[PDB]
Design an enzyme around this catalytic site. Structure first.
Site, short mmCIF file in Angstrom:
data_model
loop_
_atom_site.label_atom_id
_atom_site.label_comp_id
_atom_site.label_asym_id
_atom_site.label_seq_id
_atom_site.Cartn_x
_atom_site.Cartn_y
_atom_site.Cartn_z
N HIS A 1 -7.50 7.50 -1.37
CA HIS A 1 -8.64 7.37 -2.28
C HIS A 1 -8.72 5.97 -2.88
O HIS A 1 -9.82 5.49 -3.18
CB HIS A 1 -8.56 8.42 -3.38
CG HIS A 1 -9.71 8.40 -4.34
ND1 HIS A 1 -11.02 8.60 -3.95
CD2 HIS A 1 -9.76 8.21 -5.68
CE1 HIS A 1 -11.82 8.54 -5.00
NE2 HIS A 1 -11.07 8.30 -6.07
N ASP B 1 -8.80 11.77 1.75
CA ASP B 1 -9.29 11.61 0.39
C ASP B 1 -10.01 12.89 -0.02
O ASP B 1 -11.02 13.26 0.58
CB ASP B 1 -10.22 10.40 0.34
CG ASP B 1 -10.77 10.12 -1.05
OD1 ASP B 1 -10.43 10.85 -2.01
OD2 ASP B 1 -11.54 9.15 -1.18
N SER C 1 -15.50 6.57 -6.06
CA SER C 1 -15.24 7.84 -6.76
C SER C 1 -16.53 8.24 -7.49
O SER C 1 -17.62 8.11 -6.92
CB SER C 1 -14.01 7.67 -7.64
OG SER C 1 -13.58 8.90 -8.20
#
Lengths: 331, 331
Positions: B310, B183, B123
Site C-alpha cells: 500500500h 493492497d 488511499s
C-alpha cells in the site's frame, strides 16, 4: 399429481427417499462395495463410500488422469481435442468393481426383470454411482430405459471436458446431485489435496460417530475448502469474460487450480425445507461457494455443522420432499 | 516514442511518477486537504488521505447515500430509474473542500494558464481526486482539455449505477487507478465496516511508521477483506449468468452485500515490474480478488506485506514505468 419435484426430475419422491436410505446403509457393510435393493418396479444399486485417502488422490495435488477412452467411448474428444479428465482413484476403483464383481450381469438381470435401475451413493459412494451410470449408458441396448443416478454430498468427479461430453450426449439430466448448504464434500475436490485429507475423511466417516472419544477436525478445514472453491469459481468467471489462461496464470502467480467441475442436475438444500434446482454447470460452480458462506464467527461451530449436514440427507429429504418448496433456475 | 503505457493512457510516465510523489507528500500536511504542484504544462492537485473511520463510513455497514443530483447532473438516472449511489462520507468531505476552499477558482486559474489538470490521491485521498475530477468534468467549458485522475491504492467510491453513468458519459478513460497485488485498501470497501476499521486505518496510516512501538494489525483483517471481495465478485457472476436478486438473497440467507464497484481504467502491479491494464469493470471486480490470493501460510506475514505494498506505489512505478512490461486485456 400437480407440480412436484418428482415430476420435474422423473423420479418419484418415494424412490429418492429410498435411495437416500440405501446410500447410508451401504457404508461399511462387511467390505462389500455395493448393495442391491429391490422394490416394486425398481432396482437400487447403492455404493459404499471409502474414507481412505488413497481412494481419493492417486497423486497430489488433484489425482486426475485421462478418462478411459475404451470404457467410455462416447465421452471422447473429437479428433485431437483435449481429452476428458477424471479422478484416477475413482476410475480405478469403479473398474475394479466391474472386474471383480458381477455388477453388469446383475444390472442386465434387473432390466430384464422390468425394473428401473437407479445407481446411488453418498459421499465417495456417489462417485461410484456416477461412473456406474455412465458405463451402463455406454453399453445400453436400444429399448432399455436409461439408468438414473442420485448422489448425496458426493465429491466432484470430472473436469469441464468430461462434463461437456456428458451434456453433449444428452445424458446430463439422468444425474441428480443433492448438496447441503454447508457440506464441504461437494466442494472439497475444488482444492488441492490437503496434507490432512485423511484426518478430514476420518472426521466425516460415519463410523467415527460411534467412537467414545470425539475425533477432532483439522483446524480451519472449512475455510480452506471455501477459499479454493471461490478461486475456481472466479477463475471460470474470468474465462467467461475473455481472460486467457496464460494471463490468469500470471495473475495468480502460476499456482495450480483444480480441474474438477460439476455436471448434471444439482439440487441445493438451502434450509427451512427449501430446494433450489439448477442445471447450468457454470451457475452450479458459482453457487457451490455462494450458498455456503458463513456468518457470525463459526470458528468452533462450522466443523460440527458441516459434518451434521453431510450426514443428514435422509432427514432433510424426508421433510423437504413431503412438503415441497422448490425453485427452478433454468426451467 | 514507440509503444509505451504513457501513449496508451495519454499521460506521460514523468507525470504519473510526479503524481505518485505528490500524492504521498500530501498526507498529513499541516491539516490542508490538498496541495498544488506546478510543472511545465501541468497542474497536479494532490489530496491528503484521512485515517479517521468517520471519514470512511457515516453509518454501518456500507455508509452509502444517493449521489448528489444537483452537483453531478450528468450522473443522474434517466427518469425514475434507480439513482447512482456514492460513499456518503467521501461526498460530504469533497463538498466541504469546495465550500471552504477556493479549489474551483484555482482550477480555473491553471486551466487559463494553459496547464493540464491532474487530480491525484493515494488511499482515501484518491476518493477526493475521483470526486474532484467528476465535478470539474461537469462544469467544464467547451474548449477546456478534460482533467485526468490518477489514484494509488484508493478505496472504491461508487456503485454499479455510478460507474455505468461515468462510462455512459464517456468519462471512464480519464481515470487511472493503480492497484498493488496485495493492497487491501482497493478491496476493503467490498465488505461491511469492520468493528476494527479504525485499527485498520491506524495500521495503514503512514504517520504510524514513525512510532517507536509498532502498531499491531487486527487479527485476520486480510482474509476477512478477501472473503468479502470474493462474495461480491461471485454475486455479480451469478447475476451475469441469469440469477435474480431475490433468489441470490435466499441463497446467501439474506445478508447484506456491498454496493461499491470499480470504474475507470485499472492498472494492476502484479510483481516483477509487470503491469496489467484493463477497463472492463466486471473483469476488474473479478481480478481484485483473483490476483490477491495467498500461498504458504501468510498468517503472520500478509499484514506487513499488505502494508508495504500500500505504501510502495512510488518505488514500484519508478521501476515499472522506466522499464515496461505491460499487457492490455481490452485493447
Amino acid at each position: 399429481m400437480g407440480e412436484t419435484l418428482g415430476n420435474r426430475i422423473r423420479l418419484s419422491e418415494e424412490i429418492v427417499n429410498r435411495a437416500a436410505s440405501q446410500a447410508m446403509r451401504a457404508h461399511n457393510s462387511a467390505g462389500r462395495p455395493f448393495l442391491l435393493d429391490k422394490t416394486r418396479g425398481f432396482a437400487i444399486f447403492a455404493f459404499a463410500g471409502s474414507w481412505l485417502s488413497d481412494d481419493w488422490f492417486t497423486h497430489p495435488p488433484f489425482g486426475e488422469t485421462k478418462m478411459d477412452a475404451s470404457t467410455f467411448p462416447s465421452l471422447r474428444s473429437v479428433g485431437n481435442d483435449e481429452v476428458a479428465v477424471v479422478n484416477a482413484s475413482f476410475l480405478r476403483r469403479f473398474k475394479a468393481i466391474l472386474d471383480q464383481l458381477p455388477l453388469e450381469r446383475e444390472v442386465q438381470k434387473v432390466i430384464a426383470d422390468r425394473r428401473q435401475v437407479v445407481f446411488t451413493g453418498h459421499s465417495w459412494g456417489g462417485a461410484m454411482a456416477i461412473l456406474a451410470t455412465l458405463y451402463f449408458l455406454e453399453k445400453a441396448g436400444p429399448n432399455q430405459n436409461p439408468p438414473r443416478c442420485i448422489t448425496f454430498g458426493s465429491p466432484l468427479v470430472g473436469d469441464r471436458i468430461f462434463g461437456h461430453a456428458v451434456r453433449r450426449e444428452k445424458w446430463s439430466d439422468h444425474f441428480i446431485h443433492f448438496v447441503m448448504r454447508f457440506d464441504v464434500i461437494p466442494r472439497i475436490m475444488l482444492g488441492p489435496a490437503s496434507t490432512e485429507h485423511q484426518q478430514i475423511l476420518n472426521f466425516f466417516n460415519p463410523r467415527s460417530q460411534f467412537y467414545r472419544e470425539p475425533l477432532d477436525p483439522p483446524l480451519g478445514f472449512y475455510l480452506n475448502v471455501m477459499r479454493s472453491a471461490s478461486s475456481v469459481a472466479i477463475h471460470d468467471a474470468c474465462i467467461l469474460m475473455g481472460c486467457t489462461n496464460p494471463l490468469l496464470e500470471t495473475l495468480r502467480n502460476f499456482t495450480e487450480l483444480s480441474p474438477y467441475r460439476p455436471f448434471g442436475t444439482y439440487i441445493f438444500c438451502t434450509g427451512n425445507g427449501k430446494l433450489v434446482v439448477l442445471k447450468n454447470p457454470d451457475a452450479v460452480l458459482q453457487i457451490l461457494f455462494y450458498c455456503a458462506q458463513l456468518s457470525q464467527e463459526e470458528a468452533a461451530e462450522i466443523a460440527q455443522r458441516s459434518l451434521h449436514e453431510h450426514l443428514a440427507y435422509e432427514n432433510e429429504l424426508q421433510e423437504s420432499l413431503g412438503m415441497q418448496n422448490v425453485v427452478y433456475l433454468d426451467s
